[PDB]
Every structure is written in structure tokens, then in C-alpha cells.
Paper text:
A distinct protein complex containing Scc2NIPBL and Scc4Mau2 (Scc2/4) initiates linkage of cohesin with DNA, and an in vitro reconstitution of cohesin loading by Scc2/4 suggests that the product of this reaction is a topological protein–DNA linkage. We report here the structure of yeast Scc4 in complex with an N-terminal fragment of Scc2 and demonstrate that Scc4 determines cohesin localization through a conserved patch on its surface.
We used an incomplete model, built into a 2.8 Å resolution map, to obtain phase information by molecular replacement for diffraction data from crystals of a native protein complex, extending to a minimum Bragg spacing of 2.1 Å. Scc4 is a superhelical array of 13 TPR modules with a beta ribbon insertion between repeats 6 and 7. Repeat 8, which has a particularly long first helix, lacks a second helix and has instead an extended segment with a disordered surface loop. Residues 10–50 of Scc2 snake along the continuous inner cavity of Scc4 and emerge at both ends, with the N-terminus of Scc2 close to the C-terminus of Scc4. Several Scc2–Scc4 contacts on the external face of Scc4 are also conserved, including Scc2F86, which stacks onto Scc4Y40-Y41, and Scc2112–120, which forms a helix that fits over a hydrophobic surface on Scc4 TPRN. Mapping Scc4 sequence conservation onto our structure revealed a cluster of extremely conserved, solvent-facing residues, some of them invariant among all eukaryotes we examined.
Residue numbers in the entry:
A (entry chain B): -6 to 64, 73 to 95, 105 to 132
B (entry chain A): 5 to 383, 390 to 527, 536 to 622
Write the structure that this text describes.
């Protein structure tokens, strides 16, 4: 087919330069297509839906019940009961007993051996 | 032996827990982490003490078990243990259910079993069990004519939907949402909440949003739904405009008015979340701290606004992004630094920080993206495929073609369809450019690839909302016409006369709406605006005066961004012809000069 452009001469026509628009786009990403992935999810998370259960218990002053309080490395089913706490991805900051009641402090100290807590990653 | 009263043990379990929450934002070392979990350990053990060493009533057993299991779920990986406690509790409650009001407790057992535990597990195997049992539960409850069980059945229908989403059963999700929504009371907080979940899910997947869901979203009433959920409505309406590249001015003004009148509501309500009272004794608490907290919300809105202006790039809108993405970044840094208790798990704060970090990653990513648009060069990874996309574009910029880079990115399973499609379109452009300039020998291997890549573009486009995005729809039309018509290609691909008229007709719509002097309206994406006017000017305009004015404008427009020299050169050839035909001597001289200048730059 005939077009005036390719017929007539002009600067660069003999050089290695794109003379038609599609060839000009070979080394030009369509960057005006700005990706938006993750933005909707950002609105959607973090999200929690829960069922609040507000019911007071152990209110009867006459209640006489009391409590006796003095109480592996291989793949096992017993490790279902052994507590494994979650290693967090981050530190929330860049003495934690302060503020605890004396009784809470006392029970905590008496049972310090049981505090060999295991913290693990997913 | 050492003894404490039953209430003293119970309150100690609470004290240890609540004190851990009080310092949850102060863990800066291993020592602090040991102390935090040391407290949680004691709290759990004290709870276990009650269950094993005391005779608890059903209500006492319920309360203790729930508080304890709440910690197992949020603080530990002991999900099987948690499940055993709830399952045990459930069976005990059922034994007394006849002569004791225990429905609330039983339904909470089911919620923990079917919603909380599976979500924390995040295991496909357990999701299938949960979904199976959840559907069984719903089927059983809808058969009860009682209003309480009918409402509870609605809650667990919603749980089922959430389980379908996690299992990526997208057809089931849509079916379940529709069935769920259709049974809800119209113009209720509950229905409008579920519809927001629906719209957000669709946007996350970039699925087309049905009209009824759209109208349901717009009809959402602030005073019925509350300021927290309405902020979510407004946010989603912003994302919708962003995804379709629509105008956000109206939607910005709505947020403005909302803040003026409901700022105080969000600030005074901060932390307490959103409580949806479905029924008396059926209350759902909803937490969305990024949207429900005033500072966090504005931060998100500023991000969305800035992202929407990226494509504008060089003008005043672009300058906004370059100015305020840094603000979003710095604000986010402070939100991380000044994160507070409470009284929520350290792990809740941990997840919020992780989201904050993703926002930082978005700021950096879009900074680089806007610079790439501006300069025509590449110098994060908040979403899948973003890093290697920028790397692929870098190769293409360097004349490396980047077919293999784009192809591999379009084939990876973790990447969004949007990224896949950008990769396929760039890949098509490269291959089509090669069909044009390559000899007849390699023409065989290049045209099939064009046809192959193109069908892939059509397939993905047809199952995303991008098919309703004018920038995207126009890009498709432009690229098809460029590859099927001279003088836009030397070797145009074969096509029927019906196909030509089809795409030419699409062009006419975009060009008549975006000609250098209605959802065919294109944002001022520089490269796009030039190509549409170039294509329209070449194919649709007959008048010499009009053709000259358009070619002149196209020619000059190219200067606004880097990387546009070869495009400008081709445009320059066209403009030179129009000058030559019009016999405009001065304009021929200047245009030839500009072409000479472009040749010297390009051939460096």
C-alpha cells in the first residue's frame, strides 16, 4: 500500500529508528497502566469479627469453693497439650511485673520453674 | 496444701492476662517477649486449674473455657487443644440445654469451632472440615421456625462464606453471598454489613461487581449502619473509582463532609470497635482499625488519592503524589512508633504493624512507578509480582524485549491478574513490534505468539473488572488496531472485515470523547492520550486543518515525559506530512529540524 510518509525522505529514515508506531513501543512499557493490587485488601485487613461474651461469674459471696494451686524434643501427640507461643514478626516497641498485685507477684515467683516458655515461628 | 478461693484464682487468671495486654505494645526484646508470654502462660494455667481442680457449673465452665481458649487461639499454636476444650464444653452444654438457657453458649462454641479456630489455623484441610460442618449446621437451623435460630443461621451462613473465600471457591462465594444477602432484612445494619464484605471481596479479586450490590452499597445509610461501617462504605467507593480510573472528586467531598460531622464519633469510639446487634442476645463485634480509627483512615484515604494521581505524573495531580506519598510514609512510621494498648494481644498489634509496613512498601513502590512514568527508566514488593514487573520493564526499556521475563511473570500462580495482564500486553507489544520489523523468515514464529498472547489477554480481561476500565479497554483497542492496520505496522496481522469495523467503532467512541478538543473519558495518561489522538487523527479525521492541529498537539505533548523520543519521532513523521501537504514552509523547517534533533538523541 502507498503512504506519503514512507515515500518521501526525512531525517533518520536511513538510520535504525522506528518509522511506524508499533515499533516505537518495543522498548516502551505501557507504564500508564498503574497496578492497584493489594489496595482493596488493605481496606479489608486486618479485620476481626468476634462474639463478645459478657457474663459475670463467681459473684456469690457465700461461695466456699477453693483451689489447690501447687501445680520433649521428638514428634509426639503429647505436644498437643504443651503450649507453644507465637513468635511475632515485629517488636511492638523500638519491668513487666510492675503493676501486678502482691498476690499475683507471689504466685508468679513460686511457680517460676514452670516458666520455661517455648516461643516458635510458623 | 497451698490454697486460694475459686474467685481469687479466676481473678488472678484475669490479672495476668490483662497485665500482658497492658504491656503488649512495649515488647522490644526477647526478655520482654518472655515476660509477656510468661504472663499468658500463668493466665492459661490458672484457667486450666479451675477446669481440672474445681466443680464448675455450666455457665462458669462456659465463661472460663471461652476466656482460656481465647488465649490459646490468640497467643499459641495449640489449636487442637483449644478444639478439644470447646468440643468438650459443647457436649456438656447439650446435656443441660433442656432445663437451662444455654443457646448463647452453644452458638459461641460453634463460632469458635467453625470461624475462629479454622481462620487462625489457616489450613486448607481444616477449612474443608469447617465448611462441611458449617453447612450442616445452617441446614439444621433454618429448619427451626424460631427467630433466634433463624438469625443465628444467618451468622453461620456468613461464616460459611468466609470459609469459601479462604478455600478460593469463588463461584461458591458469589452464590453463598447472594443466597445469604437475599434472606437478610432489607435496609438493616446486618445486610449492609454483609454487602460491604461482598463488595470488598469482589474488589480484592477484581471481579466485576453486580449492579444490585453496587446499588446496595450506595444505599447504605450512615445512621443505620454507624460511622465505622459507613467509613468502610466510603473507602470501598474510593477503591471502586480507583479500579475503574474514575473521578474521585465527588467521593473525596463525601469523605470530607463525613469527617466534619463524624470525626468525633470515630475518635471517642476508638478501640471499642463496631457492635452489630443482630438480635437481642446476638451481637457481633467488628474490628477494622485501619478504617475505624480516624488517623488511620485519613492515612489510607491519602494513599488512595495519591495512587489515583500517579498516572497523571507530570502535572499538578502528579505533583500531589510526589508530595503526599512521603506524608503517608512518615504518618505510617509514627503510627507504628506510637502504637498503643489495649487490651489486645501483642499478636494483634503485630499484625497491625505488618500492615503498616506494607503501606510503607506501597509508598516506595508508587514512588518508583511515578518516576518511571516521568523519566522513562527504572532505577518494595508490597504485592506479588511487583518487583519482577519493575525488573521486566527495566529489560524492555533497555531494548532487551523482556519476553521471557513478562512470560514467566504472566505464568506464575501467585500474581494478580492485573499484573499478569500488564505483562501480557507489554509482551504483545514487543512481539507485534517484532512482527513489523523482522523479515519474513521469523514472521512465522512471531505471529502465532501474537495470536497466542492475545487470546490470553482476552480471557483474563473478560473475568476481571478491567473490562469496564476505559484506560484498559482503550489500550486493547489501540494495540489491536496498531497491529492490524497500516501504516501503524509494516506487517499487519490478518483480520476479518467484521473485526476491523468492531475495533474501529470502539476507537470512534474513545477518540470522540478524548480528542484534543461519559465513562469513555480517559484520565490524562500522557502516552495513552497521544496514541488515541494519533490513531484517531490518522483513521477518523479527513479535514486538513483538524489533522494538522491534532498532529501538532501530539508532537508537542511527547515532551512532558521521558522515554517518549521514538514515539515523538514517529509522530513527527506524520506531522511533517501534514505540513508538506498543507505547504506550510515554516512548519516544515521546524519539523525537519526537530526530527534531526531526535535522530541525534536516539542514535547516541
Amino acid at each position: 500500500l502507498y503512504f506519503q510518509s514512507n515515500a518521501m525522505s526525512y531525517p533518520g529514515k536511513d538510520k535504525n529508528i522506528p518509522g511506524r508506531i508499533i515499533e516505537a513501543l518495543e522498548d516502551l512499557p505501557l507504564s500508564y497502566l498503574v497496578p492497584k493490587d493489594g489496595l482493596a485488601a488493605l481496606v479489608n485487613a486486618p479485620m476481626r469479627v468476634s462474639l463478645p461474651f459478657d457474663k459475670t461469674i463467681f459473684t456469690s459471696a457465700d461461695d466456699g469453693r477453693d483451689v489447690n494451686i501447687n501445680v520433649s524434643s521428638i514428634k509426639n501427640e503429647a505436644e498437643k497439650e504443651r503450649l507453644v507461643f507465637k513468635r511475632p514478626s515485629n517488636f511492638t516497641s523500638s519491668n513487666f511485673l510492675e503493676g501486678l498485685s502482691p498476690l499475683a507477684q507471689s504466685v508468679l515467683s513460686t511457680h517460676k520453674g514452670l516458666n520455661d516458655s517455648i516461643n516458635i515461628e510458623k | 496444701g497451698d490454697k486460694l478461693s475459686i474467685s481469687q484464682v479466676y481473678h488472678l487468671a484475669q490479672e495476668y492476662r490483662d497485665h500482658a495486654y497492658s504491656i503488649a505494645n512495649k515488647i522490644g526484646s526477647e526478655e520482654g517477649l518472655k515476660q509477656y508470654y510468661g504472663l499468658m502462660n500463668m493466665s492459661i494455667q490458672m484457667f486450666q486449674l479451675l477446669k481440672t481442680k474445681c466443680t464448675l457449673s455450666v455457665l462458669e465452665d462456659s465463661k472460663v473455657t471461652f476466656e482460656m481458649v481465647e488465649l490459646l487461639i490468640q497467643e499459641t499454636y495449640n489449636f487442637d487443644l483449644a478444639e478439644l476444650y470447646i468440643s468438650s464444653l459443647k457436649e456438656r452444654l447439650q446435656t443441660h440445654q433442656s432445663d437451662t438457657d444455654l443457646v448463647e453458649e452453644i452458638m459461641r462454641c460453634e463460632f469458635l469451632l467453625l470461624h475462629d479456630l479454622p481462620l487462625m489455623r489457616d489450613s486448607k484441610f481444616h477449612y474443608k472440615i469447617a465448611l462441611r460442618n458449617c453447612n450442616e449446621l445452617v441446614q439444621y437451623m433454618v429448619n427451626l421456625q424460631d427467630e433466634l435460630y433463624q438469625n443465628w443461621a444467618s451468622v453461620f451462613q456468613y461464616v460459611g462464606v468466609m470459609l469459601c473465600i479462604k478455600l478460593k471457591q469463588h463461584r461458591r462465594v458469589k452464590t453463598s453471598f447472594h443466597g445469604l444477602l437475599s434472606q437478610c432484612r432489607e435496609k438493616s445494619q446486618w445486610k449492609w454489613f454483609l454487602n460491604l464484605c461482598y463488595v470488598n471481596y469482589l474488589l480484592n479479586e477484581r471481579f466485576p461487581i453486580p449492579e444490585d450490590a453496587l446499588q446496595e452499597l450506595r444505599s447504605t445509610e450512615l445512621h443505620t449502619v454507624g460511622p465505622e461501617l459507613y467509613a468502610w462504605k466510603l473507602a470501598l467507593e474510593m477503591v471502586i473509582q480507583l479500579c475503574k480510573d474514575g473521578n474521585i472528586t465527588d467521593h473525596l467531598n463525601e469523605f470530607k463532609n463525613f469527617f466534619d460531622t463524624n470525626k468525633q464519633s470515630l475518635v471517642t469510639n476508638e478501640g471499642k470497635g463496631c457492635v452489630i446487634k443482630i438480635m437481642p442476645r446476638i451481637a457481633l463485634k467488628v474490628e477494622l482499625p485501619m478504617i475505624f480509627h480516624y488517623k488511620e483512615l485519613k492515612n489510607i484515604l491519602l494513599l488512595l488519592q495519591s495512587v489515583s494521581y500517579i498516572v497523571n505524573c507530570y502535572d499538578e495531580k502528579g505533583n500531589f503524589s510526589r508530595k503526599f506519598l512521603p506524608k503517608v510514609y512518615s504518618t505510617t512510621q509514627k503510627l507504628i512508633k506510637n502504637i498503643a494498648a489495649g487490651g489486645v494481644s501483642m499478636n494483634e498489634l503485630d499484625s497491625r504493624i505488618q500492615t503498616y509496613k506494607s503501606i510503607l512498601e506501597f509508598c516506595e513502590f508508587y514512588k518508583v512507578w511515578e518516576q518511571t512514568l516521568l523519566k522513562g527508566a527504572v532505577v518494595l514488593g508490597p504485592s506479588p509480582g511487583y518487583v519482577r514487573l519493575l525488573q521486566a520493564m527495566k529489560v524492555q526499556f533497555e531494548g532487551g524485549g523482556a519476553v521471557e521475563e513478562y512470560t514467566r511473570l504472566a505464568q506464575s500462580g501467585g500474581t494478580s491478574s492485573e499484573v499478569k495482564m500488564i505483562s501480557l500486553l507489554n509482551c504483545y507489544t514487543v512481539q507485534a513490534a517484532r512482527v513489523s520489523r523482522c523479515s519474513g523468515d521469523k514472521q512465522g514464529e512471531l505471529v502465532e505468539q501474537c495470536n497466542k498472547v492475545w487470546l490470553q489477554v482476552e480471557k483474563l480481561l473478560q473475568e476481571t473488572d478491567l473490562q469496564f476500565n476505559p484506560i484498559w479497554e482503550c489500550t486493547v483497542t489501540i494495540l489491536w488496531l496498531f497491529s492490524h492496520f497500516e501504516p501503524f505496522s509494516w506487517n499487519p496481522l490478518p483480520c476479518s472485515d467484521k473485526q476491523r469495523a468492531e475495533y474501529v467503532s470502539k476507537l470512534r467512541e474513545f477518540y470522540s470523547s478524548n480528542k484534543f478538543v461519559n465513562r469513555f473519558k480517559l484520565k490524562k495518561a500522557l502516552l495513552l492520550q497521544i496514541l488515541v489522538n494519533y490513531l484517531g487523527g490518522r483513521m477518523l479525521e479527513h479535514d486538513l486543518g483538524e489533522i494538522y492541529a491534532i498532529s501538532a498537539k501530539c508532537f508537542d505533548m511527547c515532551r512532558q515525559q521521558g522515554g517518549m523520543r521514538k514515539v515523538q519521532y514517529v509522530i513527527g513523521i506524520w506531522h511533517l506530512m501534514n505540513c508538506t501537504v498543507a505547504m506550510r514552509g515554516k512548519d516544515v523547517a521546524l519539523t525537519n529540524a526537530k526530527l534531526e534533533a531526535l535522530v541525534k538523541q536516539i542514535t547516541s
